[PDB]
Design a protein around this ligand. Sequence first.
Ligand SMILES: *[C@@H]1O[C@H](CO)[C@@H](O[C@@H]2O[C@H](CO)[C@@H](O[C@@H]3O[C@H](CO)[C@@H](O)[C@H](O)[C@@H]3O)[C@H](O)[C@H]2NC(C)=O)[C@H](O)[C@H]1NC(C)=O
Ligand SMILES: *[C@@H]1O[C@H](CO)[C@@H](O)[C@H](O)[C@H]1NC(C)=O
Lengths: 49, 49
Amino acid sequence: SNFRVQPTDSIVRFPNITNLCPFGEVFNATTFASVYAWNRKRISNCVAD
Amino acid sequence: PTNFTISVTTEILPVSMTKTSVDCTMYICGDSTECSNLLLQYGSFCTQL
Ligand SMILES: *[C@@H]1O[C@H](CO)[C@@H](O[C@@H]2O[C@H](CO)[C@@H](O[C@@H]3O[C@H](CO)[C@@H](O)[C@H](O)[C@@H]3O)[C@H](O)[C@H]2NC(C)=O)[C@H](O)[C@H]1NC(C)=O
Ligand SMILES: *[C@@H]1O[C@H](CO)[C@@H](O)[C@H](O)[C@H]1NC(C)=O
């Protein structure tokens, strides 16, 4: 069997996204929506921190 | 009978088949370290094969 090779390094490759996510315009957002007419919004081009 | 005949016939027989070998860890885990460390608290189902 194989006991002779152990992986050594670990590499990461992510695309070049810089602007952070709008957590603060969907999180304080003076007025929210009623539950029976809830609000749906798409999120794109984010570094989700 | 008053005359005869010489007849040549054919018979075909298998004698052997192919020889194989299986690596247990490479088939199950496949160069993973999280696996093949969980496949050590299982039993001896890889020497007996
Ligand atoms: C026992 O059987 C054999 C056949 O297994 C007989 O032999 C055959 O004899 C005949 C007559 O002699 C041969 O016919 C000849 O054919 C040639 C052309 O191929 C022709 O030029 C001749 O004029 C004649 O017609 C036949 O070919 C021959 N077969 C073999 C394989 O030799 C044999 O005569 C029989 N014997 C008894 C005791 O009946
Ligand atoms: C709501 O979030 C926005 C985005 O950062 C910020 O500018 C604003 O001051 C916040 N309002 C309150 C009351 O925190």
